Amino acid sequence: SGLYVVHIAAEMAPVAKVGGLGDVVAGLGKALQRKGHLVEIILPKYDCMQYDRVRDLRALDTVVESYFDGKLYKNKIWIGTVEGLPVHFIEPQHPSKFFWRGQFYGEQDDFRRFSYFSRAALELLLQSGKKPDIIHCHDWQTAFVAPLYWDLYAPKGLDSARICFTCHNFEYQGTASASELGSCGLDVNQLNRPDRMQDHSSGDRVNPVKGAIIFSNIVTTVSPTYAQEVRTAEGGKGLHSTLNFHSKKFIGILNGIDTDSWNPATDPFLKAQFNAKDLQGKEENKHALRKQLGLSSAESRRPLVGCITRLVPQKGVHLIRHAIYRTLELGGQFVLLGSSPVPHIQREFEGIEQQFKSHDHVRLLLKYDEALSHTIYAASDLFIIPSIFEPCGLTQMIAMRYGSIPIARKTGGLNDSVFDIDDDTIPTQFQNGFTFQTADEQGFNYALERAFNHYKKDEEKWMRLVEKVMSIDFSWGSSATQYEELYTRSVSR
Ligand SMILES: C[C@H]1O[C@H](O[C@H]2[C@H](O)[C@@H](O)[C@@H](O[C@H]3[C@H](O)[C@@H](O)[C@@H](O)O[C@@H]3CO)O[C@@H]2CO)[C@H](O)[C@@H](O)[C@@H]1N[C@H]1C=C(CO)[C@@H](O)[C@H](O)[C@H]1O
Ligand SMILES: Nc1ncnc2c1ncn2[C@@H]1O[C@H](COP(=O)(O)OP(=O)(O)O)[C@@H](O)[C@H]1O
Ligand SMILES: OC[C@H]1O[C@H](O[C@H]2[C@H](O)[C@@H](O)[C@@H](O)O[C@@H]2CO)[C@H](O)[C@@H](O)[C@@H]1O
């Protein structure tokens, strides 16, 4: 009655996490495991992995030889249990030291790093005689699995599985010169054709995500609205034509969040616990965070605006910058937790931070910090996501789970999860926050103004909004069932 489902990905929360992809792999993984499926995950063994939620971590005695550049290479296989999921971590013994770089992403040879991993992952499956019903791969890094499976593993004895591919951001396609596709074992001449993996915008380049759209039996992305956006020329980023052709098997499914990990009632990272029925502990976290950061608590009813994000153009960094000053102008406080891989963006925020070193109302925390994010979601009254585009976004869901009311731009997943309380056309049950259309200060200001007005003018009306938003189901229940139905329908076919 239950499927055997393997997920191959570059991330899994909390052990190897950069953003939402890692969150999703774990969250969907666990939801599927509750539904009775044998779920297993295959990751790289990064040197920079987070050890502390890994149980029973051990190196197996079986070495697994894997192909790359015409030679076979040794891989140490590790197993462990990460939040009840079985995980296989691949440690390559290739002289280039692919997962020994101090970093998850951003090396000059990422293409080689993750195409190797993709090959070795399938090799691990073959060599253990595993016969999965579903192999689910994620983003460009493991897009290589789809053509690899069909070209080299279905005709070697591994022909049990259907392939599912999720793209969590179609911006990242993994494009490179065609020469580089041959490293993992794929036939360049066969696959560098317009009906296969040749890029949309060049002749001697290949496109991993395009290959995964073509070769997979199921293709998803992470919200219904984003799925529509990427079918248009302007949002598709070259791939719109391919997605329109293969539309029958392409569907957008709104991510959930892991509501066991993200739960104010049992969150171990918090000072005080709380829930929809008792917000006592929310005010206590607001006070604790102020005290930890050196923000003023002299006034009651000063709204704390939080923002937790990677600082990259996608997230509307000019609007985030503006929001700091506007929040302050409007008589609120602001806490930013974020860092940028882009130095000019890091430098711009570093300047703002110094400006507010020990200010009573503004603190900027320019770093990745898990513990702190928990207390920021808990403490904050308002949470901003003014994204230029957003495939899904999880932070707005986590914020609402912790009672913080979102202010979001109407785009991609935010359009499917955030609904303005002042728009009459929206049914009352969905209304949970504040939105704006245009990506400029004027648009953002009107949403922020209304949110500050609502917070200040009627405390008990506001408290109902918090209660209501905290009672919304953000779990994977609903969306895990949609993935399950795609899996079963493909297996039967
Ligand atoms: C958070 C984000 O993580 C992943 O994105 C990473 C890329 O996959 C990496 O390759 C790397 O991007 C570099 C490019 O490859 C390189 O060519 C150059 O353009 O520089 C880039 C930046 O160094 O780094 C990216 C992260 O910085 C993942 O693929 C992406 O999907 C993730 N974000 C989405 C995930 C979810 C979860 O479903 C959605 O909710 C969010 O809306 C997405 O934003
Ligand atoms: N600076 C940071 N410190 C701690 N957690 C962060 C930071 N930036 C982002 N996160 C976390 O990463 C995840 C972001 O996922 P998502 O909203 O899908 O955006 P993206 O995938 O583009 O980063 C959330 O769990 C969020 O709390
Ligand atoms: O090999 C070329 C071919 O690969 C994929 O074909 C799969 C197909 O998707 C599965 O349903 C099943 O029939 O196995 C096939 C492997 O040969 C792509 O789907 C197809 O478009 C591509 O050209």
Numbering used by the authors: 23 to 515
What does the published report state?
Starch Synthases (SSs) transfer glucose from ADP-Glc donor to elongate pre-existing glucose chains via α-1,4-linkages. SSs are retaining glycosyltransferases classified within the GT5 family in the Carbohydrate Active Enzyme (CAZy) database. Here we present three new crystal structures of SSs of different families and origins: the crystal structure of the catalytic domain of SSIV from Arabidopsis thaliana (AtSSIV), of GBSS from Cyanobacterium sp. CLg1 (CLg1GBSS) and of GBSSI from the glaucophyte Cyanophora paradoxa (CpGBSSI). In all cases, they are in the closed conformation forming ternary complexes with ADP in the donor site and the inhibitor acarbose occupying the donor glucose and glucose acceptor sites that approximates the active site at the time of the reaction.
The ADP binding mode in the AtSSIV structure will be described to serve as a reference for the other structures. AtSSIV binds ADP through an extensive network of interactions, depicted in Figure 2. The third hexose, here stacked between two tyrosines, has its O6 oriented differently since the threonine bound to it in CLg1GBSS is substituted in AtSSIV by a valine which cannot make side chain hydrogen bonds. One new surface binding site for sugars is identified in the AtSSIV structure. Trp172 and Phe237 form an extended and slightly curved aliphatic patch in the surface of the protein, far away from the active site. Fitting of a whole acarbose was unstable and a maltose was modeled there as a generic α-glucan, but the high B factors result in a relatively feature-less density where it is impossible to ascertain the correct geometry of the bound sugars.
